[PDB]
């Protein structure tokens, strides 16, 4: 079985009685405006996706994840979940109860345990292994406010979720896995439609794992990216036409990527552990500044993670062997070899090209096409 | 990587020894042997049957029957014996005799003992049945009433059209070492490669250094591939689809007994002597179960060659790949199971095998032969 990171699955969803009280006096508490990513962090805290966390890191915890990728008690935790405010936005003090607003929506109530300062260069360097402003995460770290705020939270509202019905929470996914008699579950994280390489990895894992938990991540989109609804419906087509039934589950999680590379891959595994997964597929270049095998290399420092990473050797499609192969068993030259790249396959479709069937399933392509505009913007 | 019994046997007579024995064949009694026995003689003499240096005596014959092991407990499952009738027994114990295939002296033999046997016990213990319809049972009954044990010395081989491909254990071992191979997996066959065969061999290559493909030359039936077709088809396959220094091809001559699981052990022993560390055991290796050939290896933990059993696989015409039921949901019409007999029948009937059954270049190589098949 998979135990929740830290021992118990966290739940911070405020009770209807607690929600009514706080919202009856919104204007008496200090209101702090948060970004959407922080609003998503809050729902991940409240539904146990971030177990054991019950709020935003305090100073001791924050410095510990920076220096060691572990909490003070040595439990693995690699991605700082913090709340920042500028001098002018700090309309509260330690010991105060504050309300975090996304736009005009009260997202959560927070008990301010501690207000502290930090070194943005140290923050940037230890998390992303670089302090170059060109790095997106470094830039977002420098834009942070001067003060971080720690303390336990309680969720009052979620950001509107067009895909609520797919957004199963850890308590539901765990009950579902057991519902299906799965003892081992392998997680596959993605932000793209499935191509044949992704199907190969998932079915490879099925030969020593009971089921696959495909977990599309809902986050900020870039122009040219597949619409989440396209990704969802594409996978539903893939399973119906190519997967045995009761061998896969599709559920979505919301999460704003930090692009901290190998340090973020550990965070990804922790999230999937809490969803109930015992294994986690780690692809190359997970989360320009990080090497392809860096995200696999870091797991050697966490033998106490209690979620088994799965590393796959390099494979490609050969147009002479007519099969997914690897260099050991294929003598064919570069023209015959087709390496899988979701980005290149995505660019074919944007450019009016048909992906060959060794890149994408016929029915998957026709589902993507069934959309007037599959991509954002 | 060590020969069964400890050391590689060699019973090939030196040319000075051979000549002196052939200068006056007059002195020795002549005994006419069947071709299959002549094949057994060259397998003895080139170490394919190590530790055996000749035909088994009584104590060894009975032990193989009862325990599938020699008196010293070394695994040996197939008796290698020489049979003569009362009329053919123009010799006694202690005599030196000459074994002849037609007018060719195949070997010189020192007779240790002449003993009798129970043909029904023989047939039953080896083949698990005494049904005369069983080919091996009938050939056991046609054996002469006397078996003859003793060490042999080979003087000639029956003509071999495939001599150049019939590398002996001492040269295969030197070749495995020359290619830096530490582990070697044997794949025995009597058919052309289809994509299932290639799948298995390349699967093994992911955890062994190289593959030793070993076509077995024996009696043919009407409709069988000619052995030169099989060989040329494999050299076409390797050249077009295998990396260099991952495959070796060599032939061994051997007449099947059809003893099922008991012969699979004997097959693995032969490949051990050739230098292999692993041995692929195909299903149904008539009267025996498909997994029995795999079940028997449990009783031989000391065999020192590792059997390799593979899970069921087939080609799916919707997945467009070799898969297995665990990962494929599609119904029977999309599933193509690999049968060497079905694929061979197609070619005999003038049909083109789909490329998911047989490589394009392999089929073209088979086509290059005007009469690829054996005719009665
Ligand atoms: Ca700042
Ligand atoms: Ca005697
Ligand atoms: Ca008889
Ligand atoms: Zn190839
Ligand atoms: Zn299929």
Domain boundaries, chain B: 15-154, 163-374
Contact B33, B44 (CB under 8 A): no
B30 CB neighbour count, 10 Å cutoff: 15
Q: How many whole angstroms separate alpha carbon B12 and alpha carbon B153? A: 6
The first and second tokens of residue B249, run together, are 């091809």
The CATH topology of domain B15-154 is Sulfate adenylyltransferase (3.10.400)
Which value in Å is the resolution of this experimental model?
2.1
- CA pair distance A358, A216, nearest whole angstrom: 23
Residues in A touching B355 (Cβ below 8 Å): 322
Task: Return phi, psi of residue B26, to 5°.
Answer: -55, -35
Task: Give the count of beta carbons closer than 10 Å to the beta carbon of residue B110.
Answer: 15
Paired sense of beta strands A30-33 and A97-102, if any? parallel
Tell if the CB–CB gap between B328 and A244 is shorter than 8 Å: yes
Count of residues in chain A? 377
For residue A115, the SS3 value is strand
A214 vs chain B: nearest CA distance in angstroms?
Answer: 16
B242/A331 Cβ within 8 A: yes
Closest of B121, A98, B22, B102 to residue B130, by C-alpha: B121
Task: For residue A206, give the nearest of B242, B246, B326 by CB distance.
Answer: B326
Q: Which residues of A202-217 are buried (b: 16+ CB within 10 A; e: fewer)?
A: bbbbbeebbbbbbbbb
Q: Taking an 8 Å Cβ-Cβ cutoff, which residues of chain A contact chain B?
A: 203, 206-207, 241-245, 247, 320-324, 328-331, 357-358
**CA–CA distances in Å: residue A269 to residues A79, A178, A263, A264:** 12, 20, 10, 9
The dotted CATH code for B163-374 is 3.40.50.620
Parallel, antiparallel, or unpaired: how do β-strands B184-189 and B247-249 relate?
Answer: unpaired
Q: Under a CB-based contact definition with an 8 Å cutoff, are residues A127 and A267 in contact?
A: no
For residue B233, give the nearest of B203, B172, B179, B192 by alpha carbon: B192
* Cβ density class A58-76: b for 16+ within 10 Å, e for less: beebbbbbbeebbbeeeeb
**B252 bridge partner residues:** B216
CA–CA separation, A276 and B181 (whole Å): 44
Active-site positions of B? Answer: 190-191
DSSP assignment letter at A317: E
Q: A27 CA distance to ligand 1 centroid (A)?
A: 28
What residues does the ion ligand 2 have nearby, CB within 5 Å?
B 113
Return d(Cα B77, Cα B73) in angstroms, integer: 11
Q: Which residues of B200-210 are buried (b: 16+ CB within 10 A; e: fewer)?
A: bbbbbbeebbb
**Number of helices and strands (H, E) in chain A?**
12, 16
Candidates B329, B354, B358: best to mutate against A (most CBs of A within 10 A) is B329
Instruction: Give the whole-angstrom CA distance, residue B111 versus residue B121.
Output: 24
Host H or E run for residue A3: none
Let me know if A95 is exposed, middle or buried by CB neighbors in 10 A (0-12, 13-18, 19+): exposed
Q: Say yes or no for a CB contact (<8 Å) between A207 and B327.
A: yes
Contact (CB, 8 A) for B5 and B50: yes
CA A107 to each of CA A38, A46, A97, A133, B179: distance values in angstroms, whole numbers, following the listed order: 10, 11, 14, 31, 68
HSE-CB of A290 using CA atoms within 13 angstroms: 23
Same fold, A16-155 and A164-376: no
Determine which of B314, B322, B327, B358 to mutate to test the interface with A (most A C-beta atoms within 10 Å).
Answer: B327
Last residue before each break in chain B (C–N > 2.5 Å)? 285
How would you class A227 by CB atoms within 10 Å of its CB: exposed for 0-12, middle for 13-18, buried for 19 or more? Answer: middle
The whole-angstrom separation of Cα B369 and Cα B364 is 9
Q: Which CATH superfamily is domain A16-155 in?
A: Sulfate adenylyltransferase (3.10.400.10)
What token pair was written down for B18? 């051979």
Backbone angles phi, psi at B343, to 5 degrees: -65, -40
End-to-end alpha-carbon separation of chain A, Å?
Answer: 43
Are the C-beta atoms of B134 and B78 separated by less than 8 Å? no
Instruction: Give the CA radius of gyration of chain B.
Output: 22
The strand pairing partners of A250, in sequence order, are A214
Q: What is the 3-state secondary structure (H, E, C) of A205-264?
A: HHCCCCEEEEEEEECCCCCCCECHHHHHHHHHHHHHHHCCCCCEEECCEECCCCCCCHHH
d(CA B219, CA B253): 10
Cite the DSSP H helix spans in chain B.
Answer: 15-23, 35-45, 58-67, 119-127, 135-141, 169-178, 195-205, 227-241, 261-274, 292-295, 340-348, 360-367
Place of tokens 């696989």: B313
How many beta carbons lie within 10 A of that of residue B175, not counting itself?
17
Experimental technique, in short, is X-ray
* Sequence-ordered alpha helix ranges (H) in A129-169: 136-142
Compare CB distances from A242 to B205, B206, B319 and report the shortest one's residue. B319
What is the rounded distance in angstroms from the CA atom of residue B228 to the CA atom of residue B234? 10
Long-range contact set of residues B313-320: C-beta below 8 Å, sequence gap at least 24: B313/B196, B313/B199, B313/B338, B314/B338, B315/B195, B315/B356, B315/B357, B317/B356, B318/A241, B318/A242, B319/A242, B320/A357, B320/A358
Residue B275 sits at the vertex; the CA angle it makes with B160 and B310, to the nearest 5 degrees, is: 100
Say if CB B277 and CB B306 are below 8 A apart. yes
**Residue B364: partners with Cβ closer than 8 Å, 6 or more residues away:** B236
DSSP-derived letter for residue B99 is: E
Q: Does domain A164-376 have CATH number 3.40.50.620?
A: yes
B102 three-state secondary structure: coil
Cα distances (Å, whole numbers) of residue B325 to B51, B122, B317, B329: 43, 42, 13, 7
Residues of chain A contacting residue B317, judged by C-beta atoms under 8 Å apart: none
- At B277, phi and psi to the nearest 5? -100, -20
Cα–Cα dist A141/A123, whole Å: 7
In residues, how long is chain B?
Answer: 376
CB atoms within 10 A of CB B2: 15
Q: Which two tokens stand for residue A347?
A: 């660019």
B7 φ/ψ angles, rounded to the nearest 5 degrees: -130, 155
Sign of CA dihedral A67, A68, A73, A76: positive
Look at residues B147, B149, B144, B157 and name the one whose alpha carbon lies nearest to residue B38.
Answer: B157
| C-alpha to C-alpha distances, B43 to A93, A133, B80, B191, B370, nearest whole angstrom | 93, 75, 10, 22, 32
């Amino acid at each position: 079985v998979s135990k929740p990171h830290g021992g118990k699955l966290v739940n911070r969803v405020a009770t209807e009685k607690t929600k009514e009280k706080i919202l009856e006096e919104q204007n008496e508490f200090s209101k702090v405006q948060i970004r959407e990513g922080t609003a998503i962090d809050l729902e991940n805290i409240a539904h146990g996706v971030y177990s054991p966390l019950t709020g935003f890191l305090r100073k001791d915890e924050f410095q510990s994840v920076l220096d060691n990728m572990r909490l003070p008690n040595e439990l693995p935790w690699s991605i700082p979940i913090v709340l920042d405010v500028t001098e002018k936005e700090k309309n509260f003090g330690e010991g105060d109860v504050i309300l975090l607003y996304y736009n005009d929506t009260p997202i959560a109530k927070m008990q301010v345990d501690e207000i502290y300062t930090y070194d943005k260069k140290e923050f940037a360097k230890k998390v992303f292994k670089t302090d170059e402003e060109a790095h997106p995460g470094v830039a977002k770290t420098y834009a942070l406010g001067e003060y971080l705020v720690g303390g336990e939270i309680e969720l009052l509202n979620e950001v509107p979720n067009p895909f609520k019905s797919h957004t199963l929470r850890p308590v539901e996914t765990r009950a579902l896995f057991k519902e299906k008699g799965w003892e081992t579950i392998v997680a596959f994280q993605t932000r793209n439609v499935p191509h044949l390489g992704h199907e190969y990895l998932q079915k490879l894992a099925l030969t020593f794992v009971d089921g696959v938990f495909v977990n599309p991540v809902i986050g900020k989109k870039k122009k040219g990216d597949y619409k989440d609804e396209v990704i969802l419906k594409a996978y539903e087509t893939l399973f119906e036409h190519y997967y045995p039934k009761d061998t896969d589950i599709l559920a979505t999680v919301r999460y704003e990527m930090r692009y901290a590379g190998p340090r973020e891959a550990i965070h990804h595994a922790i999230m999937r552990k809490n969803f109930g997964c015992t294994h986690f597929i780690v692809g190359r270049d997970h989360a320009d500044y990080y090497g392809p095998y860096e995200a696999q290399e870091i797991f050697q420092n966490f033998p106490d993670l209690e979620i088994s990473p799965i590393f796959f050797r390099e494979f490609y499609y050969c147009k002479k062997c007519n099969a997914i192969v690897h260099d050991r068993i294929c003598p064919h030259t570069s023209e015959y070899r087709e390496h899988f790249s979701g980005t290149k396959i995505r660019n074919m479709i944007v450019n009016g090209e048909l992906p060959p069937e060794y890149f994408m399933r016929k029915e998957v392509y026709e589902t993507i096409r069934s959309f007037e505009n599959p991509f954002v913007d």
